[PDB]
Amino acid sequence: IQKGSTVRILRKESYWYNESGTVVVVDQSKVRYPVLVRFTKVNYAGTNTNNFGLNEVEEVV
């Protein structure tokens, strides 16, 4: 995955679970949740972006 890639959220406790988002940036450092994904639908708190782990996102073909 990279910037601009489309991924499916696999985190169950997510307002965008099973949904598709756009990767903003994948951090190359040793952070726990490097993948930053932007969504079109705001969550219940109003935010439309979140940091996800490498195993919590699945790239769409």
| Residue ranges in contact with other proteins by CB under 8 A | 11-15, 17-20, 27, 29-33, 43, 45, 47, 50-51
Shortest spacing between CB 56 and other proteins, in angstroms: 10
Element (H, E) at 35: strand 35-38
Say if CB 9 and CB 18 are below 8 A apart.
yes
Shortest spacing between CB 54 and other proteins, in angstroms: 15
Pairing relation of β-strands 49-52 and 6-9?
A: unpaired
Shortest spacing between CB 38 and other proteins, in angstroms: 13
